[PDB]
Write an enzyme that holds these catalytic residues in place. Structure first.
Site, mmCIF file in Angstrom:
data_model
loop_
_atom_site.group_PDB
_atom_site.id
_atom_site.type_symbol
_atom_site.label_atom_id
_atom_site.label_comp_id
_atom_site.label_asym_id
_atom_site.label_seq_id
_atom_site.Cartn_x
_atom_site.Cartn_y
_atom_site.Cartn_z
ATOM 1 N N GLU A 35 0.820 -1.062 0.101
ATOM 2 C CA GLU A 35 0.115 0.103 0.052
ATOM 3 C C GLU A 35 0.783 1.195 -0.066
ATOM 4 O OE1 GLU A 35 -3.125 0.532 -0.684
ATOM 5 O OE2 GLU A 35 -4.047 -1.286 -0.103
ATOM 6 N N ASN A 46 -6.749 9.282 -5.818
ATOM 7 C CA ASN A 46 -7.467 8.498 -6.495
ATOM 8 C C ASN A 46 -8.098 9.153 -7.765
ATOM 9 O OD1 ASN A 46 -8.419 7.044 -3.157
ATOM 10 N ND2 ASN A 46 -6.802 6.042 -4.320
ATOM 11 N N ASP A 48 -11.545 9.163 -8.292
ATOM 12 C CA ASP A 48 -12.739 9.880 -7.732
ATOM 13 C C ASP A 48 -12.530 11.302 -6.965
ATOM 14 O OD1 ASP A 48 -11.868 8.816 -5.185
ATOM 15 O OD2 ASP A 48 -13.554 7.475 -4.847
ATOM 16 N N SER A 50 -11.026 11.931 -4.174
ATOM 17 C CA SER A 50 -10.517 11.621 -2.872
ATOM 18 C C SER A 50 -8.836 11.257 -2.753
ATOM 19 C CB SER A 50 -11.165 10.422 -2.404
ATOM 20 O OG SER A 50 -10.834 9.085 -3.161
ATOM 21 N N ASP A 52 -5.621 9.048 -0.844
ATOM 22 C CA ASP A 52 -5.414 8.008 0.246
ATOM 23 C C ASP A 52 -3.920 8.530 0.942
ATOM 24 O OD1 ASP A 52 -7.304 6.290 -0.938
ATOM 25 O OD2 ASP A 52 -5.780 5.362 -2.363
ATOM 26 N N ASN A 59 -8.333 5.867 2.548
ATOM 27 C CA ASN A 59 -8.995 6.766 1.913
ATOM 28 C C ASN A 59 -9.976 7.646 2.436
ATOM 29 O OD1 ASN A 59 -11.714 6.917 0.130
ATOM 30 N ND2 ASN A 59 -10.178 6.948 -1.234
#
EC number: 3.2.1.17
Length: 129
Positions: A35, A46, A48, A50, A52, A59
């Protein structure tokens, strides 16, 4: 902070993460590896909107407030920047809420594509725990 493999394994166990909701340690350390590469400050935006954040790339649409994700739910009741700290406490306490959500570690796409069903035991192998 960039953790070392067994250094993060021991911090995650210390925080109740070894076998939290059935996910041996090994799963959690493999998840942080793919990750964020064990780096508490890593952030990724991301498609969309948003973004992380942290060791377990948590998120900003469901779990934390970053002030720039409209419609977000902040279920861990925390500013997303608490997740970047060198103390994994906030990241581990949020991850505990996410694994309990019904889908386990499948919430993490790199865990299910790269970890899941691998010898996640290898990620804690030479460590004093």
């Amino acid at each position: 902070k960039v953790f070392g493999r067994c250094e993060l394994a021991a911090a995650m166990k210390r925080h109740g993460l070894d076998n939290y909701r059935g996910y041996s340690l090994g799963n959690w350390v493999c998840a942080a590896k793919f990750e964020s590469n064990f780096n508490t400050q890593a952030t990724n935006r991301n498609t969309d909107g948003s973004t992380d954040y942290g060791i377990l790339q948590i998120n900003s649409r469901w779990w934390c407030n970053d002030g720039r994700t409209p419609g977000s739910r902040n279920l861990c009741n925390i500013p997303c920047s608490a997740l970047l700290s060198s103390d994994i406490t906030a990241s581990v306490n949020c991850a505990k809420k996410i694994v309990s959500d019904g889908n386990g570690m499948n919430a993490w796409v790199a865990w299910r594509n790269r970890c899941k069903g691998t010898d996640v035991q290898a990620w804690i192998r030479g460590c004093r725990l």
